[PDB]
Scaffold this active site. Structure first.
Site, PDB file in Angstrom:
ATOM      1  N   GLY A   1      46.289  44.728  43.070  1.00 28.40           N
ATOM      2  CA  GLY A   1      45.680  43.412  43.148  1.00 28.40           C
ATOM      3  C   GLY A   1      45.701  42.666  41.829  1.00 28.40           C
TER       4      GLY A   1
ATOM      5  NE  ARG B   1      42.341  38.177  42.831  1.00 33.23           N
ATOM      6  CZ  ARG B   1      42.281  38.738  44.042  1.00 33.23           C
ATOM      7  NH1 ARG B   1      42.366  37.996  45.166  1.00 33.23           N
ATOM      8  NH2 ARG B   1      42.149  40.057  44.140  1.00 33.23           N
TER       9      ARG B   1
ATOM     10  CD  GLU C   1      28.416  41.896  29.912  1.00 31.65           C
ATOM     11  OE1 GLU C   1      28.242  41.021  30.770  1.00 31.65           O
ATOM     12  OE2 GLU C   1      27.707  42.903  29.782  1.00 31.65           O
TER      13      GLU C   1
ATOM     14  CB  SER D   1      36.321  48.216  29.402  1.00 30.37           C
ATOM     15  OG  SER D   1      36.066  46.847  29.189  1.00 30.37           O
TER      16      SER D   1
ATOM     17  CE1 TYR E   1      30.983  47.369  35.520  1.00 31.50           C
ATOM     18  CE2 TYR E   1      31.369  47.493  33.148  1.00 31.50           C
ATOM     19  CZ  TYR E   1      30.566  47.142  34.220  1.00 31.50           C
ATOM     20  OH  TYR E   1      29.365  46.526  33.989  1.00 31.50           O
TER      21      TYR E   1
ATOM     22  CG  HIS F   1      38.928  43.712  33.119  1.00 34.38           C
ATOM     23  ND1 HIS F   1      37.868  42.888  33.432  1.00 34.38           N
ATOM     24  CD2 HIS F   1      39.350  44.242  34.292  1.00 34.38           C
ATOM     25  CE1 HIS F   1      37.683  42.896  34.735  1.00 34.38           C
ATOM     26  NE2 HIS F   1      38.561  43.717  35.280  1.00 34.38           N
ATOM     27  N   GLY F   2      38.197  47.156  32.254  1.00 33.70           N
ATOM     28  CA  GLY F   2      38.371  48.372  33.030  1.00 33.70           C
ATOM     29  C   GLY F   2      38.122  48.052  34.483  1.00 33.70           C
ATOM     30  CB  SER F   3      39.224  47.442  37.418  1.00 29.94           C
ATOM     31  OG  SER F   3      38.638  47.110  38.684  1.00 29.94           O
TER      32      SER F   3
HETATM   33  C1  LIG Z   1      37.270  38.520  42.391  1.00 31.88           C
HETATM   34  C2  LIG Z   1      38.541  39.342  42.188  1.00 31.88           C
HETATM   35  C3  LIG Z   1      38.161  40.644  41.537  1.00 31.88           C
HETATM   36  N1  LIG Z   1      37.404  40.401  40.274  1.00 31.88           N
HETATM   37  C4  LIG Z   1      36.070  41.009  40.200  1.00 31.88           C
HETATM   38  C5  LIG Z   1      35.265  40.139  39.336  1.00 31.88           C
HETATM   39  N2  LIG Z   1      35.887  40.139  37.975  1.00 31.88           N
HETATM   40  C6  LIG Z   1      35.262  40.474  36.817  1.00 31.88           C
HETATM   41  O1  LIG Z   1      35.866  40.421  35.736  1.00 31.88           O
HETATM   42  C7  LIG Z   1      33.953  40.975  36.793  1.00 31.88           C
HETATM   43  C8  LIG Z   1      33.744  42.286  36.323  1.00 31.88           C
HETATM   44  C9  LIG Z   1      32.465  42.882  36.243  1.00 31.88           C
HETATM   45  C10 LIG Z   1      32.228  44.241  35.806  1.00 31.88           C
HETATM   46  N3  LIG Z   1      33.075  44.630  34.665  1.00 31.88           N
HETATM   47  C11 LIG Z   1      34.225  45.289  34.962  1.00 31.88           C
HETATM   48  O2  LIG Z   1      34.555  45.573  36.126  1.00 31.88           O
HETATM   49  N4  LIG Z   1      35.085  45.688  33.942  1.00 31.88           N
HETATM   50  C12 LIG Z   1      34.789  45.462  32.609  1.00 31.88           C
HETATM   51  O3  LIG Z   1      35.607  45.863  31.755  1.00 31.88           O
HETATM   52  C13 LIG Z   1      33.608  44.790  32.305  1.00 31.88           C
HETATM   53  C14 LIG Z   1      33.291  44.518  30.968  1.00 31.88           C
HETATM   54  C15 LIG Z   1      32.116  43.844  30.644  1.00 31.88           C
HETATM   55  C16 LIG Z   1      31.261  43.445  31.677  1.00 31.88           C
HETATM   56  C17 LIG Z   1      31.556  43.692  33.020  1.00 31.88           C
HETATM   57  C18 LIG Z   1      32.750  44.373  33.359  1.00 31.88           C
HETATM   58  C19 LIG Z   1      31.382  42.113  36.672  1.00 31.88           C
HETATM   59  C20 LIG Z   1      31.590  40.817  37.150  1.00 31.88           C
HETATM   60  C21 LIG Z   1      32.857  40.238  37.215  1.00 31.88           C
HETATM   61  F1  LIG Z   1      33.002  38.972  37.661  1.00 31.88           F
HETATM   62  C22 LIG Z   1      37.289  39.708  37.908  1.00 31.88           C
HETATM   63  C23 LIG Z   1      37.963  39.870  39.152  1.00 31.88           C
HETATM   64  O4  LIG Z   1      39.125  39.474  39.212  1.00 31.88           O
END
Ligand SMILES: CCCN1CCN(C(=O)c2cc(Cn3c(=O)[nH]c(=O)c4ccccc43)ccc2F)CC1=O
Length: 351
Positions: free
Chosen positions: A211, A218, A328, A244, A247, A202-204
């Protein structure tokens, strides 16, 4: 101050993720007006109210006018001020606009947590702020030894799962950390023996990590437009590191990113080829698997502390008319994730 006994890699991690200027940089990247919506005036009810208007915009788009859309679009910009001068900002009249703005609000949620940790708490000059900010994460962070077996397996995961279509950059691993968010192992107990537990990426962006480490990965709130997320509102992971790593949103102007490996309890996967904006799983399913055309070679799956690591090179999955080039994985209950590692990455851009 007393100077901090934390390992240097752990200190540089804390510097990165609590950097106020990086938070601001992310916000102006989203075209937010910092004069009108500065970092300190950000709040959860403002973000949630914006999410709702975006749900209104979603409604008006699903049932088709640029006349009646205009009002909803403007209401969005009223709640989150954008940087357009004396303007007329661009109209939010399609599904792409909704996806893009929902993603921005997701980030703002994480930035608000980071900044609230920074402005909550106490002030003591005689403590190293690095130690002070570390404690705020409520996360045990250790450096994994370069020569350990777990380090070898992780580096192999990275080495083997970089997709050819993401070859505009490559990755080196600078630091591997073992992480333990307070209470997360306890929360995970119901799923710790479930079948199909997988170590996934999971990349961000680095501005979300404070956070993530304090609050965990979350679910986006009730107000958020379900249509903004391809498989609805859940926690998304990949089995290809580059999928990932995209992202992280690194670039030539800031090339260091952060990526997680979590143990994900997938169990019985609801397998999908195309967008489905669901708010609950079918009965008996625990996860969604978005079916990639390509998958890590399932014969090269290896085990790490009893969890499957899909670290094979990419081969054909056999799935035919899919929207997804790669896999995914989505879960819809926060308790199905136990975060295990955090990598700091060097991105070599070849362009
Ligand atoms: C709502 C608090 C922040 N948040 C953002 C939403 N979230 C996600 O995991 C999420 C992340 C993405 C985009 N994304 C992403 O950001 N990282 C990934 O590694 C990833 C891998 C496969 C598909 C999408 C990815 C898209 C929709 C989502 F719901 C978890 C999360 O905690």
């Amino acid at each position: 101050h007393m100077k901090s006994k934390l390992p240097k890699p752990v200190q540089d991690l804390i510097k990165m993720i609590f950097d106020v200027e990086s938070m601001k940089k992310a916000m102006v990247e989203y075209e937010i007006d910092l004069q009108k919506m500065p970092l300190g005036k950000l709040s959860k009810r403002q973000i949630q109210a914006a999410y709702s208007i975006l749900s209104e915009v979603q409604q008006a788009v699903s049932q088709g006018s640029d006349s009646q859309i205009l009002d909803l679009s403007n209401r969005f910009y009223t709640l989150i001020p954008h940087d357009f001068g004396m303007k007329k900002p661009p109209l939010l009249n399609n599904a792409d606009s909704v996806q893009a703005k929902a993603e921005m609000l997701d980030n703002l949620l994480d930035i608000e947590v980071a900044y609230s940790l920074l402005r909550g708490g106490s002030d003591d000059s005689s403590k190293d702020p690095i130690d002070v900010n570390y404690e705020k994460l409520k996360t045990d962070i250790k450096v994994v030894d370069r020569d350990s077996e777990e380090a070898e397996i992780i580096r192999k995961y990275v080495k083997n799962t970089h997709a050819t279509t993401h070859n505009a950059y490559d990755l080196e691993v600078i630091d591997i950390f073992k992480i333990e968010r307070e209470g997360e192992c306890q929360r995970y107990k119901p799923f710790k023996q479930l079948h199909n537990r997988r170590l996934l990426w999971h990349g961000s962006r680095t501005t979300n990590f404070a956070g993530i480490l304090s609050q965990g990965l979350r679910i986006a709130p009730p107000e958020a437009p379900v249509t903004g997320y391809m498989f609805g509102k859940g926690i998304y992971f990949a089995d290809m590191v580059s999928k990932s790593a995209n992202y992280c949103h690194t670039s030539q102007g800031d090339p260091i990113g952060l990526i997680l490996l979590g143990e994900v309890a997938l169990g019985n996967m609801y397998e999908l080829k195309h967008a489905s904006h669901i708010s609950k799983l079918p009965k008996g399913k625990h996860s969604v698997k978005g079916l990639g055309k390509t998958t890590p070679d399932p014969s090269a799956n290896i085990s790490l502390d009893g969890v499957d690591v899909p670290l094979g090179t990419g081969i054909s999955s056999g799935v035919n008319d899919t929207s997804l080039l790669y896999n995914e994985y989505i879960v819809y209950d926060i308790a199905q994730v136990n975060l295990k590692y955090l990598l700091k990455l060097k991105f070599n851009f070849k362009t």
